[PDB]
Design a protein around this ligand. Structure first.
Ligand SMILES: *[C@@H]1O[C@H](CO)[C@@H](O[C@@H]2O[C@H](CO)[C@@H](O)[C@H](O)[C@H]2NC(C)=O)[C@H](O)[C@H]1NC(C)=O
Ligand SMILES: *[C@@](O)(CCNC(=O)[C@H](O)C(C)(C)CO)Cc1ccccc1
Ligand SMILES: *[C@@H]1O[C@H](CO)[C@@H](O)[C@H](O)[C@H]1NC(C)=O
Ligand SMILES: *[C@@H]1O[C@H](CO)[C@@H](O)[C@H](O)[C@H]1NC(C)=O
Ligand SMILES: *[C@@H]1O[C@H](CO)[C@@H](O)[C@H](O)[C@H]1NC(C)=O
Length: 463
């Protein structure tokens, strides 16, 4: 047992297979995957050379995301259950046709570092299995973890597939996967999983993991679902360490990797301008200590409305119709409600920028586009233009700094993720805090202009 460790995550500019009309050969698939593994090896060795205990690499980092069932097939391997007790590097012939697992095992062993990666699983089946797909096998999006001896210690099949992941199957039941180390208990899940209850919430609530490792290939959607923004907020809301390893592909708005602790981001990377990968390291506590449990409706339910006779308007945020009120002065106090959710904001801007409009919004309803999930959100955000019809649209930059803010709401859930995002998609580590009574508030003037301050709530039972 050790009290701290060094975490590493790598943002990877993947080598994508070329567009072809029919499946490539096993041999071609393996040659491509090995070209990606050559680059990941560079990151793994560099991290180990700086004393890292664990490194995470991204979802689809080894073969990309452009597949149907058949074009994916040659990239797949049969990945056994870790209960078999297998070190591929030391016993390479135990299960045949497993060169990717072998190389990952050797990378972990030779650099004595835990290695988290995402590859593809195939599970052959018969018609005797009533669930067996017509084409004779299951295909899974699969995280694998190898320990510092090269032993396979975790295998996780992605539960919540994103629209367009037609090449993979959904597992029969959600797989709750953990692995224990000398530097804490770890849980694992993948990209889209972060928006759902199973396995993500269960790992924290039932299995009490200290840290999440998180391969992802996330497409950023402002104002609330940029990777570094939402991932760091989830970590703070769930009170776990969080190691997010993302694909680097600006063409599809993929960039946003980091290492996040319960109180704050520790390192983050965002880059839409280059095609470079990036390795991040940071120290973390093996067993983070926590403050008291946050009651998200406590302060909000205790006060009278901060404003009345609001001039309210409708605005669209990522396809959801929020109820907004405009912030008129350089300082103010507003309350706005939609159905069961009332949202309260107190603020003071550093300067009124005349052509820049900010609004406070509330949403309480079911999201349906690109996925189905129930939301309660209170948001302060920079409107894209001066027109109120653009409040909620994607806004990349702003000029208004804030001297103070305090946001809260009457949430009917205890799963709330506190987000703060500054202009140019920068996080604000150490500049804000969450109180026990559910207030997201500033500790000092913001170091840069504000894109949003948001409390993003999930009511999993209403999905
Ligand atoms: C209404 O908003 C104002 C900000 O414009 C709040 O003012 C307080 O400002 C002082 C600065 O001297 C801070 O110390 C406090 O932190 C601010 N408010 C807090 C903590 O609530 C004012 O309090 C707001 N009204 C409320 C909350 O009823
Ligand atoms: C990944 O699961 C995609 C998840 N989708 C997003 O990042 C999406 O932009 C939001 C933020 C969840 C909004 O709906 C993996 C993936 C990557 C590429 C293609 C398909 C799936
Ligand atoms: C894709 O084709 C280009 C051009 O011939 C080639 O340089 C590259 O190596 C190819 N990649 C793969 C995976 O075949
Ligand atoms: C592991 O190191 C040994 C050194 O002899 C060698 O067999 C192999 O090339 C190495 N593999 C990796 C992936 O580092
Ligand atoms: C949270 O606070 C509200 C209002 O103060 C109270 O009614 C509720 O019982 C509290 N819930 C928990 C779980 O502490």
């Amino acid at each position: 047992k050790q009290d701290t460790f060094i975490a590493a995550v790598y943002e990877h500019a993947a080598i994508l297979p070329n567009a072809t009309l029919t499946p490539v050969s096993r041999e071609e698939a393996l040659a491509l995957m090995n070209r990606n593994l050559d680059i990941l090896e560079g990151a793994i060795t560099s991290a180990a050379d700086q004393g890292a205990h664990i490194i995470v690499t991204p979802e689809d980092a080894i073969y990309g995301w452009n597949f149907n069932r058949d074009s994916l097939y040659p990239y797949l391997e049969d990945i056994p259950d870790p209960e078999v007790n297998w070190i591929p590097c030391n016993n390479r012939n135990r299960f045949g046709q497993t060169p990717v697992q072998e190389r990952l095992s050797c990378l972990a062993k030779n650099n004595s570092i835990y290695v988290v990666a995402n590859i593809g699983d195939k599970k052959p089946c018969d018609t005797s299995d009533p669930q067996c797909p017509p084409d004779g096998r299951y295909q899974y999006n699969t995280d694998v973890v190898f320990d510092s001896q090269g032993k396979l210690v975790a295998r996780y099949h992605k539960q919540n597939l994103f629209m367009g992941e037609n090449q993979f199957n959904v597992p029969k039941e959600p797989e709750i996967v953990t692995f224990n180390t000398t530097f804490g208990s770890f849980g694992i899940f993948t990209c889209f999983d972060i928006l759902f209850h199973d396995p993500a919430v269960t790992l924290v609530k039932d299995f009490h993991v200290d840290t999440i490792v998180f391969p992802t290939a996330w497409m950023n959607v402002l104002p609330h679902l940029s990777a570094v923004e939402f991932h760091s907020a989830w970590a703070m809301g769930m009170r776990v360490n969080f190691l997010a390893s993302n694909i680097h592909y600006p063409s599809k708005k993929m960039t946003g990797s980091g290492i996040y602790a319960p109180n704050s981001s520790r390192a983050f990377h965002y880059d839409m301008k280059t095609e470079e990968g990036k390795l991040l390291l940071s120290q973390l506590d093996s067993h983070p200590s926590h403050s008291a449990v946050v009651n998200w409706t406590s302060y909000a339910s205790s006060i009278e409305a901060l404003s009345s006779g609001n001039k309210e308007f409708k605005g669209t945020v990522f396809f959801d119709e929020f109820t907004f009120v405009k912030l008129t002065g350089v300082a103010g106090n507003y309350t706005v409600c939609q159905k069961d959710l009332c949202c309260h904001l107190s603020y003071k801007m550093s300067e009124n920028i005349p052509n820049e409009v900010y609004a406070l919004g509330a949403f309480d309803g079911l999201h349906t586009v690109e996925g189905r999930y129930y939301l309660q959100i209170c948001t302060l955000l920079k409107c894209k233009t001066t027109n109120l019809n653009t409040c909620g649209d994607s806004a990349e930059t702003a000029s208004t700094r804030f001297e103070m803010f305090s946001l809260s709401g009457t949430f009917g859930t205890q799963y709330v993720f506190p987000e703060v995002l500054l202009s140019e998609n920068q996080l604000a580590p150490g500049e804000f805090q969450v109180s026990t009574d559910g207030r997201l508030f500033s500790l000092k003037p913001t170091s840069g202009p504000v894109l949003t301050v948001t409390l993003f709530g999930r009511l999993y039972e209403k999905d």
